[PDB]
């Protein structure tokens, strides 16, 4: 089983994302959204080729979209390490 760890601030991002969705759409939508995020985490931990190279932000940084958000992460020997989960409005794609 591939490993999946989160920086403390990424887990705090998820909490803010959950609360934002909860406040406007209620529990079921917020839980669904975190479920979509969780499913994408597992897919990224299993398949190195999905990761988008974000060296232009930081060397070795990877990105992947889910919904209106972007998982920013790094590859590890056994899986991934999630650094931040940010709204896509924060993105800076490669020039």
């Amino acid at each position: 089983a591939n490993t999946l760890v989160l920086k403390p601030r990424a887990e705090q991002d998820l909490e803010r994302i959950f609360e934002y969705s909860y406040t406007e759409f209620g529990w079921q939508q917020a839980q669904q959204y975190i479920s979509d995020l969780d499913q994408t985490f597992q897919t990224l931990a299993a398949s190195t080729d999905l990761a988008i190279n974000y060296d232009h932000v930081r060397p070795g940084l990877k990105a992947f979209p889910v919904g209106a958000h972007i998982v920013f992460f790094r590859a590890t020997d056994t899986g991934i390490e999630v650094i931040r989960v940010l709204h896509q409005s924060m993105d800076y794609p490669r020039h």
């Binding site: 999946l4 989160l6 990424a10 705090q12 959950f18 909860y22 969780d38 931040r84």
Partner: protein, 80 residues
Amino acid sequence: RTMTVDTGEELRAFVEGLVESGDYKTNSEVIRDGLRLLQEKTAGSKLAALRQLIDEGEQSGEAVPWDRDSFLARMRQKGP
């Protein structure tokens, strides 16, 4: 998709005056003008801003295994 915001009394009155003068049609138009200014202020340094957010993630402590069940339990424990 609207949002309900508390501007505080000083900025609320500022918004009211601009609407009642006819310079802006609605509260929303005033708010959008302000948000456009805030977006423009940072539009040119999105890369530095993203780098800062990533760095703050990197510097936020040792990564820990993701535990979805604990997360959702913590979410319902907050004001059940």
